[PDB]
């Protein structure tokens, strides 16, 4: 890398806020059905023309908008993630960044010096990460909606590559938006499906499963996997993308509680995005681990071997890495 | 054109940004100036906990800043990652951590109001430069990092422009003064002076005296907006990267005062980084305009024709563009 690469990356928060500010203004929706110049976009946004134009010029220069003779145009290929009404809209992630992650990363240096999250220094809030994240129903929605889209390729692969038919009942601990049990329901009518979630997420999840027609099919159980509050004859239990939100010590407490609640002969699968064997990457995972530092209660990313050892210390038999292609690593053990 | 994954990557780009500024502010790379060290050793040198130190080191390794296990600082990177080397990016990092990153947090409201966010982010309704220069350490931070930015422009300006044309030279807003210093090394007879704001002037006197130019470059406090400018035989006057820190209307005042101040037959040169002809790029310049929006008193980037119009309206004769080596466009006016 060059000196210029470093300067670009050091100032990469410029691009990041240009996009989140535009999404929050719903700037791109001003171009859903028409092309417009800056003066017209500003007037409809009820924003001064000069500063609206400054943002529009930046978004064109970044390549998200086209501009011909002062007329801005939204590329057809960008509509799916820039428009509010679209399934891949990034506005959910945008708000999560604006509300939580960008403020907390502002204090990264201190998080590293103390190995401590920055929720109190940044927010003046001593509550737990998920209590802070979940204080408003809209913040629960943003978080679960953007994670759900991120999880879609994993879920599709899991359902296509693992034989869920061999189990009678399946519990998804920390399912989030519930798109895994939903996909399992679409594929296997016979298996019982349940979710165990924290209270605020249970409430969002109940309303969403009900609206989408799964209210009779997927049982929602409030609980806490760290305190031991869990339902239950589940011969398959899954934990997706939750271990990394907690310190390794807590991950052992979570895994021991799950083991204890399992039925005999039960199977357990955790899915994570681990660091590579020599903990040299991948880059987004390495940076995610820093995100867990500043925001969560002890979270960190780990290697596959580290999850494997944790399964064995927690009491699981035949702990192993599932031989399954996809964006996650699946760690599996039995009771 | 761009994909959802590209947009996500750029929305999360504050990850890489803060990873680098945190690493610089912790002096992390300095612990690899002499030796290759593991995380636990680097962490003891830094007095940070090994866990979070390793988390940062893995991120830096995956971003390609470090090799590794023992971490190794690539030779090509020493120049800008080591704190006592002449291209150190640590000055930039402190300016980002103290001023730019927090103010970009409020970009949306800046755009909605066409107004800097100094008051809302800092609880301080003084001037940009008064807030920026509140503390001589932030003066040094600002002036030093800008100095590194200007070094290719300065080499090209001293290269492709003939300063022997001129008996005396006045640099308004010279900042760290490295342009007069370069003119001094190359043109032993020309009189050299600087007009700066009071706090920049205090830093400048110290910095020029330390470097051995204290008897060679006159430092004179003043205010180009108010018209408080020195008078000598300044047959060349320069204004480097200052117009874009103020509103067009205010640039008019600055240029009008400069014209009133120059001797007959004199030449004035403003050096800017203009937006292109249809104001659609380049990307860094377009985002710098937003940076000026969130921080300065009305600042914005402009096209070259926009600067030409201002030179003409302020009364300059023979207003023209000069193309030179380096990242800056020179706008020339005469009396
Ligand atoms: N102590 C706890 N008990 C139960 N659920 C918890 C928990 N701590 C966090 N969670 C839940 O774990 C989820 C992690 S986000 C992961 C979502 C989903 N499983 C996926 O694979 O994409 C969140 O929804 C959060 O509410
Ligand atoms: N009203 C004013 N009168 C004189 N100098 C001013 C001024 N307002 C801002 N400045 C100065 O303008 C400079 C802008 S930063 C530009 C630094 C340098 N000329 C370069 O080319 O890189 C700052 O040093 C600031 O102190």
TrEMBL record, chain A:
PROSITE patterns: SAM_OMT_II
InterPro entries in the record: COMT-like, COMT_C, COMT_dimerisation, SAM-dependent_MTases_sf, WH-like_DNA-bd_sf, WH_DNA-bd_sf
This protein's UniProt keywords: Methyltransferase, S-adenosyl-L-methionine, Transferase
Domain O-methyltransferase C-terminal: 105-317
Active site: 244 (proton acceptor)
Domain of life: Bacteria
Residues that, per the record, bind S-adenosyl-L-homocysteine: 144, 197, 224-225, 328
GO molecular function: O-methyltransferase activity; protein dimerization activity
Domain O-methyltransferase dimerisation: 10-82
GO terms under biological process: methylation
Alphabetized Pfam families for the sequence: Dimerisation, Methyltransf_2
PANTHER family referenced in this protein's UniProt entry, alphabetically: O-METHYLTRANSFERASE CICE (PTHR43712:SF2), PUTATIVE (AFU_ORTHOLOGUE AFUA_4G14580)-RELATED (PTHR43712)
Protein name: Methyltransferase domain-containing protein
């Amino acid at each position: 890398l060059t000196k210029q690469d470093a300067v670009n990356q050091m100032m990469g928060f410029f691009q990041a806020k240009a996009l989140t500010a535009a999404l929050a203004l719903k700037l791109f929706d001003q171009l859903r059905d028409r092309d417009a110049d800056a003066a017209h976009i500003a007037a409809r946004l009820d924003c001064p023309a000069r500063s609206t134009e400054q943002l529009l010029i930046a978004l064109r220069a970044m390549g998200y908008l086209d501009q011909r003779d002062g007329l801005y145009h939204l590329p057809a290929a960008h509509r799916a993630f820039l428009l509010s009404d679209e399934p891949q809209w990034l506005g959910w992630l945008g708000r999560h960044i604006d509300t939580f992650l960008y403020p907390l990363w502002g204090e990264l240096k201190t998080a590293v010096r103390n190995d401590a999250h920055q929720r109190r220094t940044v927010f003046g809030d001593d509550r737990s990460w998920f209590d802070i994240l979940y204080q408003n129903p809209d913040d629960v929605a943003d978080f679960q909606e953007f994670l759900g889209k991120f999880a879609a390729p994993f879920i599709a692969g899991f359902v296509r590559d693992y034989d869920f038919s061999q189990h009678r009942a399946f519990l998804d601990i920390g399912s989030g938006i519930g798109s895994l049990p939903m996909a399992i329901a679409d594929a296997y009518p016979g298996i019982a499906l349940a979710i165990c979630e924290l209270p605020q997420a249970s409430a969002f999840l109940r309303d969403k499963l009900t609206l989408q027609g799964y209210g009779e099919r997927i049982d929602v159980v409030e609980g806490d996997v760290i305190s031991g509050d869990l339902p239950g004859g589940y011969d398959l239990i899954h934990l997706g993308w939750m271990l990394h939100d907690y310190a390794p010590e807590t991950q052992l407490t979570i895994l021991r509680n799950i083991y204890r609640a399992m039925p005999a002969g039960g199977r357990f699968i955790a899915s994570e995005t681990p660091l590579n064997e020599d903990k040299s990457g991948p880059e987004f995972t390495a940076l995610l681990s820093l995100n867990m530092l500043v925001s969560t209660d002890g979270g960190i990313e780990s290697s596959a071997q580290e999850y494997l050892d944790r399964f064995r210390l927690a009491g699981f038999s035949n702990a192993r890495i599932m031989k399954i292609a996809g964006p996650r690593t699946l760690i599996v053990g039995e009771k």
